[PDB]
Design a protein around this nucleic acid. Structure first.
Ligand SMILES: [Mg+2]
Ligand SMILES: [Mg+2]
Ligand SMILES: [Zn+2]
Ligand SMILES: [Zn+2]
Ligand SMILES: [Zn+2]
Length: 143
RNA sequence: GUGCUCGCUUCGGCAGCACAUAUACUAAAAUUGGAACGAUACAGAGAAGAUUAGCAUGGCCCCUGCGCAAGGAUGACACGCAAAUUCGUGAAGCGUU
């Protein structure tokens, strides 16, 4: 039933209170995963996945660093069991990147010129506010 | 948006400085047009008397095949062929009478 777990050992003792939100988010990700490809779009059908991923990982980032309500061993375990995302967290550590939409939208190779996608640009630089949903994430102005 | 100014300065905002910087055939679309070796239906097989094995040449003809192999009715099509030429036409120049 759960994210059937490879480590075979006991999850530490702070795991049962992060359990319910984690699971419900997981069943949620399964529903957003199954939501089937109607006249929806093709480029826009992966956006919910990056929502829920960012959400999972922002949750565990709260329950470690912002509240200090989890042991670091349980933390690395929740990294290893796919509930968290190592590289999202590792960027979120940086200065300008608090609200990173996903890890790709800063991958410069995915664009022709080797620059980040406009998702990264602050809203002040535009000053015109034409609504932009970044192709990769679907995000609207992460930072 | 995060943070720091022994910032105005309370815990509000505002300020300032630091960091963070530019995706995209933008379309779920909308047109636009050839073909399917499918019926149909016609049509209907090289060489000399007859029945027939092929291997080629040629070129805006292709198909199956990894193929520089092999096959496809000898894969098909090649089917007027022109031409100079035996003697004259005339035309125009250069010299002779
Ligand atoms: Mg042959
Ligand atoms: Mg032939
Ligand atoms: Zn963004
Ligand atoms: Zn983006
Ligand atoms: Zn994004």
């Amino acid at each position: 039933m759960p994210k059937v777990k490879r480590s075979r050992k006991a999850p530490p003792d702070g795991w049962e209170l992060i359990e319910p939100t984690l699971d419900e988010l997981d069943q949620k990700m399964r529903e957003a995963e199954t939501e089937p490809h109607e006249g929806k779009r093709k480029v826009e059908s992966l956006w919910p996945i990056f929502r829920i991923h960012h959400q999972k990982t922002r949750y565990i980032f709260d329950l470690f660093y912002k509240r200090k309500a989890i042991s670091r061993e349980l933390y690395e375990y929740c990294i290893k069991e796919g509930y968290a995302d190592k590289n999202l967290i590792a960027k979120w550590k940086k200065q300008g990147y608090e609200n990173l939409c996903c890890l790709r939208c800063i991958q410069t190779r995915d664009t022709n010129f080797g620059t980040n996608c406009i998702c990264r640009v602050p809203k002040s630089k535009l000053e015109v506010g034409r609504i932009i949903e970044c192709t990769h994430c679907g995000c609207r102005g992460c930072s």
